[PDB]
Design a protein around this ligand. Structure first.
Ligand SMILES: Cc1cn([C@H]2C[C@H](OP(=O)(O)O)[C@@H](COP(=O)(O)O)O2)c(=O)[nH]c1=O
Ligand SMILES: [Ca+2]
Length: 129
């Protein structure tokens, strides 16, 4: 897989971000994770975590997987990086997202994220507390 450039348009919530990609505004949904909705427990914390991570970043990138690049809502499906750190993994490591929505053929980073989730669970962080 390979990283491509994007720029932040607006934080939305823990697992969706509005980015400009190839010059076009798009909502991206983070592959292989599920944050709580803003109205659920840890929802506000997830949103703030993602927001901080993408607003502080000098460089945003998106990485598509091998399979579908947009979902049925027209959201881009990618791993999103902030100054080289994957947001998807960072949410999971902090106990602010569960590994989820693992579809065959868009699951390149599945085991990386499951290792993060195991460590968040051992530490009893956030969702796992
Ligand atoms: C993460 C992801 C979500 N989706 C769809 C499945 C779910 O459909 P439903 O809307 O029918 O529940 C929805 C979950 O996204 P949200 O967690 O953003 O609601 O997005 C995909 O199709 N592919 C994906 O890779
Ligand atoms: Ca969600």
């Amino acid at each position: 897989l390979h990283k491509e450039p994007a720029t932040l348009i607006k934080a939305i919530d823990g697992d969706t971000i509005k980015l400009m990609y190839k010059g076009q505004p798009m909502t991206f949904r983070l592959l292989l994770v599920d944050t709580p909705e803003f109205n659920e427990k840890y929802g506000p914390e997830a949103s703030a975590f993602t927001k901080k991570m993408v607003e502080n970043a000098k460089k945003i990138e998106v990485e598509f997987d091998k399979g579908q690049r947009t979902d049925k809502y027209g959201r881009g499906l990618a791993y999103v990086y902030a100054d080289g750190k994957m947001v998807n993994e960072a949410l999971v490591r902090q106990g602010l997202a569960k590994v989820a929505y693992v579809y065959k053929g868009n699951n390149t980073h599945e085991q990386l994220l499951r290792k993060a989730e195991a460590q968040a669970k051992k530490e009893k962080l956030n969702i796992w507390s």
